[PDB]
From a paper:
The latter was then refined at 1.99 Å resolution (R/Rfree = 0.19/0.22). As expected, Mtb-FbiD adopts the same MobA-like nucleoside triphosphate transferase family protein fold as CofC: a central 7-stranded β-sheet (six parallel strands and one antiparallel), with α-helices packed on either side. FbiD has a cone-shaped binding cleft with a groove running across the base of the cone, formed by the C-terminal end of the central β-sheet. Moreover, we did not observe GTP binding in either our co-crystallization or differential scanning fluorimetry experiments. We speculate that the GTP binding site is not formed until FbiD/CofC interacts with FbiA/CofD, enabling catalysis to proceed through to formation of dehydro-F420-0.
Cofactor F420 is a deazaflavin that acts as a hydride carrier in diverse redox reactions in both bacteria and archaea. Mass spectrometry (MS) and protein crystallography are used to demonstrate that PEP guanylylation is catalyzed by the FbiD/CofC enzymes that were previously thought to act upon 2-PL.
Numbering used by the authors: 7 to 211
């Protein structure tokens, strides 16, 4: 059995992926965000090195979906006026997950084209470092952050790749297109769909 505690943080679905609003009705946009989480979780759950998957979210629909796939779920109590709610949530989940795992991996929940093998390989590569990350497709963001026997020090948000790099996290290379293809914009979604999205995202779009 595995040694990696995987964390995914998910914001309120109404707030999520607002740059997809031009191509989706609000209910369809929320459905796409949830479906991308489902496909990401499904791909991740195939990775043999995982001990657990923990989803932290204030969104009860996302909570139900994750729990319904056999993930651990943490309610996110982070106030609305917290200046950095994403990293606050990750750090909160980390404190819990750290009780049961020494090696923790934070994964974006909007990777609908993720293949199990891609994540497995990324984690194998990460084992050679204390802290490491995979940049997303366009290079400014972070698809995955990995910490082996040390604190994550997450710097997700704008310009996270650069911030992670500055923090001393080593950048992993490895094509892993499905791992890198996070979906923020319609262009990102087009790219993901060309790689091949999982069935939940296929249905939602």
């Amino acid at each position: 059995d595995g040694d990696i505690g995987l964390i995914i943080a998910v914001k309120r679905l109404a707030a999520a992926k607002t740059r997809l609003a031009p191509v989706f009705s609000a209910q369809t946009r929320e459905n796409v965000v949830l479906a991308m989480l489902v496909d990401t979780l499904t791909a991740a759950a195939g990775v043999g090195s995982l001990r657990s998957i923990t989803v932290i979210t204030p969104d009860e629909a996302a909570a139900a979906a994750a729990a319904g796939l056999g993930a651990d779920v943490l309610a996110d109590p982070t106030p609305e006026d917290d200046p950095d709610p994403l990293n606050t949530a990750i750090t909160a989940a980390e404190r819990v997950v750290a009780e049961g795992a020494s090696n923790i991996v934070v994964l974006q929940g909007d990777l609908p084209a993720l293949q199990t093998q891609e994540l497995a390989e990324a984690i194998s590569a990460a084992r050679h470092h204390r802290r490491s990350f995979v940049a997303d497709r366009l290079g400014t963001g972070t698809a995955v952050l990995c910490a082996f026997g040390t604190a994550l020090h997450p710097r997700f948000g704008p310009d996270s790749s650069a911030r992670h790099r500055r923090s001393g996290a080593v950048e992993l290379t490895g094509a892993w297109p499905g791992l890198r293809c996070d979906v923020d914009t319609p262009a990102d979604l087009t790219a993901a769909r060309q790689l091949g999205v999982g069935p939940a995202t296929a249905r939602a779009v």
